[PDB]
Design a protein around this nucleic acid. Structure first.
Lengths: 174, 126, 52, 50, 49
RNA sequence: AGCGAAUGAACUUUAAAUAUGUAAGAAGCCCUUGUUACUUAACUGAACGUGGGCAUUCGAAUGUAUCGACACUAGUGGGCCAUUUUUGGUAAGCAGAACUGGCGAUGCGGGAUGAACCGAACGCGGGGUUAAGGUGCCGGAGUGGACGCUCAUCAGACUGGCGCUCAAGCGU
């Protein structure tokens, strides 16, 4: 959903005389800005631990930048999708350089193939397959194979869309 | 219970006795007594229609009508306002009399010591 | 007879705010931060950030 | 002129005060929760019809 | 603050330069423009003033 | 939610959501004492006479280009659609209630004509920016970008026609 950012949202119940020093619940939310991160964090804490926005407050909202965004790695993501029939658990692999990019691709893939919305997907966990062979998706295993090298046949040349008429018929060997 | 003429009375309407029962539009309402009988009581209650208000005079007997607890806030507020204004005039200091609408919270810090945050996931699997 | 924008017309800003000339002269909009070596982020904060 | 002196300095020191509180509370194993906003700007952006 | 804000006439703002979101009659959390945007309102003000 | 508290939706420490009546001082407050045509065993209450102090938070917010009473004067008594809540029946539609919004008495932009629905409500002009809706051509504006899927012997179009297939289709 746009430029998603991983946000570390820490939040706690409001302190009372009977119950001081709450439990400081923390969650990682992939959201385009901080307002969505806080709202989704409450949507999840309303679900899980039964605290509310009116009776709670946000301790902290921090950006979790990728440690090494110049290294390609393998991500495995567990997710729960509420369909027309009901909720189903899935697990998908993605070859991206950052956790944010994997989640963005995940959203595009589950929108294209299963017609799933942003509000109908619950990202259970996002892990990195550090060890080879951990990947189970055949497409990803093809990319992780030994000494990969593939040509690019029939490459459509980027011609200008405002160049209407061309004197020479183009070639697709570039 | 004994009822005067001109007291604020709220009605709740049970189903124990069906004699002289009012409609569900009057169920759980509040009005002002103008008429008291041996059994029934005449109450004025305001009614909405479109853009305006019409007073309606209705008759409910004793077991569904009771004195309301809406006005006692007024008497307790005037009593405390008078008494702390008396103390403020005696001690020569300004004090706060009105009701404040509860301004938003200020800034503070919470310690990570002995309160290490826990990490959660959308589903609670255990 | 004609409203003039103080953000576009500098004379109108000087009329309403006499401090604008010395706000621009003394560069109070390009003020620098306090000097000295800044400390490093605590390890606890970093291990909390990249948790499970 | 003197009131503008005090106001501009007031703005800059509240900004630096909030930043310094956040930094020191991050260092001392804590989390400084900023004060909630006291001012809001509301823009009606829908028509006066239905 | 009562008298200072009541003294000011309501601000007659122009339409935003750059437009709204593609579906502005929806909440800001759901990719719209309604509701609370918090600090992001500054950008809206910078488009409408 | 808990019942590592008791007890058993009818369990409850706590407590939603959602709507709707009443009160927010000067036309006010409290208490003390006499009278009355009333009332009750009895100032038990009610009314008429008491006293005090509070006009520099006079007792929340916000708005306030104002409201009440009296008197006088024209046109009107359709129904329809939709929403929220509720009841009953049918093979399925459907039937009975209250609710606001509109139409009658409404122009403009979109919506393939209309209508419904979405936007937005109207003095005469110039400039700028948008809403809903769109940017292959008719038609003003992208044969824009990223990721996948689909070849259908009359696909599909957030299609009207022409037409389109690494789309001019679908989801983000």
């Amino acid at each position: 959903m746009g430029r998603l950012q991983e946000y570390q949202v820490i939040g706690r119940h409001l302190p009372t005389e009977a119950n001081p020093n709450p439990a400081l619940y923390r969650m990682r939310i992939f959201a385009p800005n901080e307002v969505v991160a806080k709202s989704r964090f409450w949507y999840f804490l309303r679900g899980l631990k039964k605290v509310k926005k009116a009776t709670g407050e946000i301790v902290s909202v921090n950006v979790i930048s990728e440690k090494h965004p110049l290294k390609v790695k393998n991500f495995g993501i567990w997710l729960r999708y509420d369909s027309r029939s009901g909720t189903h658990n899935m697990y998908k692999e993605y070859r991206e350089t950052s956790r944010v990019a994997a989640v963005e691709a995940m959203y595009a893939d589950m929108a294209a193939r299963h017609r799933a919305r942003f509000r109908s997907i619950h990202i259970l966990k996002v892990v990195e397959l550090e060890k080879t062979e951990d990947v189970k998706r055949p497409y990803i295993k093809q990319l992780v194979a030994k000494n990969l090298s593939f040509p690019l046949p029939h490459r459509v040349p980027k011609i200008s869309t405002k160049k209407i008429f061309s004197a020479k018929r183009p070639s697709t060997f570039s | 219970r004994t009822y005067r003429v001109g007291d604020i009375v709220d009605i709740k309407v049970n189903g124990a006795v069906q004699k002289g029962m009012p409609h569900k539009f009057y169920h759980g309402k509040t009005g002002v007594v103008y008429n008291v009988t041996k059994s029934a009581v005449g109450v004025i209650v305001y009614k909405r229609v479109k853009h305006r208000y019409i007073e309606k005079r209705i008759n409910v007997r004793i077991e569904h009508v009771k004195p309301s607890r809406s006005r006692e806030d007024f008497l307790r507020r005037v009593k405390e306002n008078a008494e702390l204004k008396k103390k403020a005039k005696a001690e020569g200091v300004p004090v706060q009399l009105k009701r404040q609408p509860a301004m938003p919270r200020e800034a503070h810090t919470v310690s990570i010591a002995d309160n290490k945050p826990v990490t959660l996931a959308p589903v609670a699997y255990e | 007879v004609q409203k003039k924008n103080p953000l576009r017309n500098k004379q109108i800003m000087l009329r309403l705010n006499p401090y604008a000339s010395t706000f621009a002269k003394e560069k109070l909009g390009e003020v620098k931060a306090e000097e000295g070596k800044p400390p490093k982020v605590p390890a606890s904060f970093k291990e909390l950030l990249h948790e499970a | 002129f003197k009131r503008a002196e005090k106001y501009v300095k007031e703005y800059r020191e509240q900004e630096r005060e909030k930043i310094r509180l956040a930094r020191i509370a991050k260092q001392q194993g804590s989390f400084h929760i900023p004060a909630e906003a006291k001012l809001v700007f509301v823009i009606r952006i829908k028509g006066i019809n239905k | 603050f009562k008298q200072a804000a009541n003294f000011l006439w309501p601000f007659k703002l122009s339409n935003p330069n750059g437009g709204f979101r593609p579906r502005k009659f929806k909440h800001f959390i759901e990719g719209g423009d309604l509701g609370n945007r918090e600090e992001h309102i500054n950008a809206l003000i910078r488009a409408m003033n």
